[PDB]
Amino acid sequence: LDTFQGYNAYSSALGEYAKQKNIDQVENIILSQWSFFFDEEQFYKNQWYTGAADGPVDVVLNEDLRNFANIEVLEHISSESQAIDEGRKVLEKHGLQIVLMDFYYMNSFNWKSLSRFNVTREHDPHFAVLTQINENSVHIIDPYYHHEENMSMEDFIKSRNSMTKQGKISFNSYEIFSNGTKKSNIKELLYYRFNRYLQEKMFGKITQFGQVVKKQLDNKDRKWAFTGYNCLNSVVYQHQNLINLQKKFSLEMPPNLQELLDNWALIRKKLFEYYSRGSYNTEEISNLICKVASSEEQFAQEVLKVL
Numbered sequence: 001l002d003t004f005q006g007y008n009a010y011s012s013a014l015g016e017y018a019k020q021k022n023i024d025q026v027e028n029i030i031l032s033q034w035s036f037f038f039d040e041e042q043f044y045k046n047q048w049y050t051g052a053a054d055g056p057v058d059v060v061l062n063e064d065l066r067n068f069a070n071i072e073v074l075e076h077i078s079s080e081s082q083a084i085d086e087g088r089k090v091l092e093k094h095g096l097q098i099v100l101m102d103f104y105y106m107n108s109f110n111w112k113s114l115s116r117f118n119v120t121r122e123h124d125p126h127f128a129v130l131t132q133i134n135e136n137s138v139h140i141i142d143p144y145y146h147h148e149e150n151m152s153m154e155d156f157i158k159s160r161n162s163m164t165k166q167g168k169i170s171f172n173s174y175e176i177f178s179n180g181t182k183k184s185n186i187k188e189l190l191y192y193r194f195n196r197y198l199q200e201k202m203f204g205k206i207t208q209f210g211q212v213v214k215k216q217l218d219n220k221d222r223k224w225a226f227t228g229y230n231c232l233n234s235v236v237y238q239h240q241n242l243i244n245l246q247k248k249f250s251l252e253m254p255p256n257l258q259e260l261l262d263n264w265a266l267i268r269k270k271l272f273e274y275y276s277r278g279s280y281n282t283e284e285i286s287n288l289i290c291k292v293a294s295s296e297e298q299f300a301q302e303v304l305k306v307l
Contacts, residue, residue, distance in 0.1 A: 002146070024069075029065055070180055
C-alpha cells in the first residue's frame with residue numbers, strides 16, 4: 001500500500017491518521033525528526049536497543065508534538081467489555097482508530113522476500129490503524145509495513161489483550177488531540193532537532209553501539225544482530241525523510257546526505273548477513289558503525305551552518 005512511512009510503527013500510524021484526516025503539522029514534525037538512542041541494558045535482554053527512538057511509544061516525538069504544535073497524543077486504556085463499542089463510536093465519528101496490537105497476530109512483513117523462511121513469531125507491541133469493525137472480522141492497515149489484513153474478531157481481541165516482551169496490551173488506543181495548534185516552519189523544526197542531536201551527543205550513542213558490537217566476537221547467540229537490523233530501519237527512514245524534505249522545500253543540505261543513507265543501509269546488510277550467514281566480521285561491522293558516528297557528528301554541524 002501507499003501508506004505514510006514515518007520512521008517507526010508509532011510515527012507511521014500518527015502520520016497515516018494525520019494524512020487521511022487533514023490534521024496539520026503532524027506529518028512535518030515526524031518527517032523532520034533527527035534522533036539516535038542506544039540502551040546497553042536492552043541489548044543484553046535482546047529487547048529493541050537502538051535506532052531512532054525507544055518504543056513502542058516515541059516519548060521524544062510526543063514532546064516535539066506538544067512543544068511545536070501543542071498537539072497531545074492521549075492514551076485510551078479500555079476493557080474487552082468497552083473496547084470494541086468505543087472503536088465503533090470512533091469509526092462512526094472519525095473513520096479510523098490508532099491501536100496497539102501484538103505483532104504475533106499480524107503477518108505484515110514477508111521475510112521470505114529476503115530469503116528468511118524461519119519466520120519466528122514474537123509477542124512484540126506494534127501500532128496499526130483500525131478502519132472497519134464487522135461481526136467476527138476487522139480490517140486494519142499496518143502503515144509501517146504498507147500491509148492491510150482482514151482479521152477474525154477473536155484474533156483482533158487476542159492481539160489487543162496480549163502479554164508481550166514489553167508488557168501487557170489492554171486495548172490501548174491513541175487519540176491525536178489539540179488544545180490550540182501552532183504553525184512551525186520546516187527550517188525551525190530541523191534547527192531544533194540538529195541542535196538537540198549535538199547537545200545530547202546522540203552521535204556518541206552510535207559510537208557506544210559500535211563498541212558493544214566489537215565485543216560480540218565470541219558471542220554464539222547472534223539474535224542481537226537481527227534485533228539491530230530491525231531497529232536501524234528507523235535510521236534509514238529518517239535519512240530518506242530528510243532527502244524528501246530537501247526535494248519538497250528545496251532546502252540547503254550538506255552534500256553527503258545520500259552517502260550517509262548508503263552507509264546505514266550497508267550496516268543493516270552486514271548485520272543481516274552476520275545474523276544469517278555465520279561470518280566472523282563483528283570487527284568490520286563495529287568499524288562501519290564507528291565511521292558513520294564521526295560522519296553523522298560532522299553532518300549535524302554542517303546542517304546548522306547551511307540550513
